[PDB]
Ligand binder design. Structure first.
Ligand code: 402
Ligand code: SF4
Ligand code: SF4
Ligand code: SF4
Ligand code: SF4
Ligand code: FES
Length: 570
């Protein structure tokens, strides 16, 4: 094909004008196009271009054709785009100062680019009609919503629940949950993939910043611990680029924020493995029940509760790393510090919105003490650091407090799809064989395929394992009958494609950057690199963890560990 774009000739592909332009350093804007789909109904038309002889077309869904002459920047094109943006301003409370997307908003960028102006500024006097903060995990601010459909499409594609809907409310279109219910009261997973898809501040996480501020100000001993994924991602929000390991800077920043103890959820990950690998070995000895499923992803737990309740008894009884850590923080940690358990306030930093729901489940407490008092997302921590004027990108490295802060390489990889599986197999196989095996890499469970399997030899018998990478793939695995091609023994499920590194609490990424950078792979690489360089690569070799079990919990899977570190869903 010979195509002319802005008077420059190209000889080439069967692709859209937008993709060809993005591949050839030609500027075309876009808004509603994401995840390979636009808002098929009510298209934004921000990607308008002129095709000579045809007229104005949407570049995001128009294929190039031999002989095409395209102009991306004529007066007629720019006036059309400007008009569409102006119409969006008419429904948009354009008040960026206090907005939680001020630094990385796709809409502000477009307003500036086209010098767009509302025909009538939208100045709602009462936000309460527009705001839904009922959920434990998600919030909606419809004063910001462009009705671009990105969230609806992302929910459908990533989860297949269609829990995010277009709704007709009083003759007007909104997005929201089924019947405009609180999300939590629907089949929604609370995974936040809708948030990640949103170009503006319309969808957000339910804030826990109040909880944290108040605890830090209460003369309370405030512990903080971050998830695996945070250290592979938060630097994105400090202009550091992608794939940067910022672990040591985070520890320094958390001390500067005034936390009293700097621990790490990866220590909790090693605890989960102690319990869960022990359980797997028991199920092997007992001839089942099989399969055992992981229980550490709250989004998956809700998927099982909402769609597959017959599987709940097959979930591992080990608490998630977050909850198992929290339980220990109110029991073990007082025993080594002298703190009154009631005065410990435990904060986690997570790449996840569904972790807020998990932490707030009524039974996730003992003796009146919550396992976890507050959960802030990666985004919330970045805001806290910025509000404190901490110069994150140039901080010196520090280390965690060791007693609940050391982690093995097995715990380090939890945030990638297949990480829990690999970590668990490293311990299970030693436990079942009563041996110290040098070969610990399970590359067959790694990477971005939607469903992954492997056959593993454990103590001279073959077992089948599966890794389900994303909620939509759980539905595929079940509905297709794949779960029945063989007897599966152990199955990891993550709700977010890529695992937690791509969770709903993570930094937003510009659609153009997503096309240039494989965010799932690049964030995960930080974690696998840590494992490669850690002196301990098995959870049961974490020295601080060994001390905690030796001194306090006893043997995994029994005694005090069974009594308090487990949770079953009825
Ligand atoms: N709890 C817990 Fe997990 C651990 O460790 C996180 O913190 Fe995850 C991450 N990153 C999240 O959110 S949850 C699911 N399993 C994989 S990783
Ligand atoms: S969503 Fe974007 S354009 Fe709207 S107020 Fe927030 S930062 Fe400004
Ligand atoms: S939290 Fe997840 S399941 Fe719920 S609407 Fe958003 S994308 Fe869909
Ligand atoms: S909530 Fe966000 S992604 Fe969903 S339609 Fe509104 S602006 Fe678009
Ligand atoms: S995969 Fe990770 S970030 Fe996503 S819902 Fe599950 S625990 Fe949360
Ligand atoms: S980006 Fe093409 S119609 Fe919205």
């Amino acid at each position: 094909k010979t195509i002319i774009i802005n008077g420059v000739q190209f000889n080439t592909e069967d692709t859209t004008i937008l993709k060809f332009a993005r591949d050839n350093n030609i500027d075309i804007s876009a808004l509603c196009f994401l995840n390979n789909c636009n808002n098929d109904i009510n298209k934004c038309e921000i990607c308008t271009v002129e095709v000579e002889g045809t007229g104005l077309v949407t570049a995001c869904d128009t294929l190039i054709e031999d002989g095409m002459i395209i102009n991306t920047n004529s007066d007629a094109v720019n006036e059309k785009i400007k008009s569409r943006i102006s119409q969006l301003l008419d429904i948009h409370e354009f008040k960026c100062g206090p907005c939680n997307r001020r630094e990385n908003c796709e809409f502000l960028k477009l307003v500036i680019k086209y010098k767009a102006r509302a025909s009538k500024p939208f100045l709602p006097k009462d936000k309460t009609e527009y705001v839904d903060e009922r959920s434990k995990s998600l919030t909606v601010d419809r004063t910001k919503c462009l009705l671009c459909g990105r969230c609806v499409n992302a929910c459908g594609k990533n989860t297949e629940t269609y829990a995010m809907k277009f709704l007709n409310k009083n003759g007007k279109t909104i997005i929201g949950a089924e019947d405009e219910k609180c999300f939590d009261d629907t089949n929604c997973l609370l995974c936040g993939q809708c948030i990640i898809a949103c170009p503006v501040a319309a969808l957000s996480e339910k804030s826990h910043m109040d909880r944290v501020k108040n605890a830090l100000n209460a003369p309370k001993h405030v512990i903080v611990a971050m998830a695996p994924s945070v250290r592979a991602s938060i630097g994105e929000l400090f202009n550091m680029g992608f794939g940067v390991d910022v672990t040591g800077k985070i520890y320094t920043a958390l001390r500067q924020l005034g936390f009293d103890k700097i621990f790490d959820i990866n220590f909790g990950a090693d605890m989960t493995i102690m319990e869960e690998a022990t359980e797997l070995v028991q199920r092997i000895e007992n001839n089942g029940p099989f399969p055992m499923f992981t229980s550490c992803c709250p989004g998956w737990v809700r998927q099982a509760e909402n769609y597959y309740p017959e599987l709940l008894n097959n979930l591992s009884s080990a608490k998630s790393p977050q909850q198992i850590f929290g339980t220990a923080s109110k029991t073990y940690y007082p025993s080594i510090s002298g703190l009154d358990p009631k005065n410990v306030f435990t904060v986690t930093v997570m790449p996840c919105t569904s972790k807020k729901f998990e932490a707030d489940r009524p039974q996730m407490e003992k003796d009146g003490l919550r396992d976890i008092d507050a959960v802030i997302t990666t985004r919330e921590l970045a805001k806290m650091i910025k509000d404190a004027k901490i110069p994150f990108a140039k901080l010196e490295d520090s280390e965690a407090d060791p007693a609940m802060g050391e982690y093995s390489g097995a715990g380090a990889i939890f945030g990638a799809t297949g990480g829990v599986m690999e970590a668990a197999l490293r311990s299970a196989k030693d436990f079942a064989e009563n041996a110290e095996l040098e070969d610990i890499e399970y590359k067959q469970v790694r990477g971005l395929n939607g469903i992954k399997e492997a056959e593993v030899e454990i103590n001279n018998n073959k077992y089948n394992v599966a890794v389900i990478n994303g909620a939509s793939n759980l539905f595929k695995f079940m509905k297709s009958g794949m779960i029945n091609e063989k007897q599966y023994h152990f199955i990891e499920v993550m709700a977010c494609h890529g695992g937690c590194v791509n969770g709903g609490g993570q930094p937003h990424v510009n659609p153009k950057d997503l096309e240039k950078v494989d965010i799932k792979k690049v964030r995960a690489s930080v974690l696998y690199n840590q494992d490669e360089h850690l002196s301990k690569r098995k959870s049961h070799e974490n020295t601080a963890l060994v001390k905690m079990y030796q001194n306090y919990f006893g043997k995994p899977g029994e005694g005090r560990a069974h009594e308090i570190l487990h949770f079953k869903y009825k």
